[PDB]
Amino acid sequence: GSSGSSGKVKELNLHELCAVCLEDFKPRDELGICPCKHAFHRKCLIKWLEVRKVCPLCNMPVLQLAQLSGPSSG
Ligand SMILES: [Zn+2]
Ligand SMILES: [Zn+2]
């Protein structure tokens, strides 16, 4: 964990924080958006998907993309 509130900190407050790692999302790292209106770290997701092929937020089974994006289905 983190403990040591000290020094001047200037980090715009937001209402969006990862669920797997629980760390303020950063632009430097790519963000993957899910069909459940939930975004996560390209790493957090990929990994979390291995141990649990579900969303750590809504907890919905995301195996196949229902939406008709491309003929890459079959
Ligand atoms: Zn994360
Ligand atoms: Zn979700």
From Swiss-Prot:
Signal peptide interval: none
Q: Which domain of life is it from?
A: Eukaryota
Which ranges of the sequence are coiled-coil? none
Q: How does it assemble?
A: Interacts with TRPC1, TRPC3, TRPC4, TRPC5, TRPC6 and TRPC7.
Point out which parts of the chain are RING-type zinc fingers, as ranges. Answer: 18-59
Organism, by scientific name, is: Homo sapiens (Human)
Name its cellular compartments: Golgi apparatus membrane
**Residue numbers of the full-length protein present here:** 68 to 128 of 148
Function according to Swiss-Prot or TrEMBL: May play a role in TRPCs intracellular trafficking.
What's the protein here called? RING finger protein 24
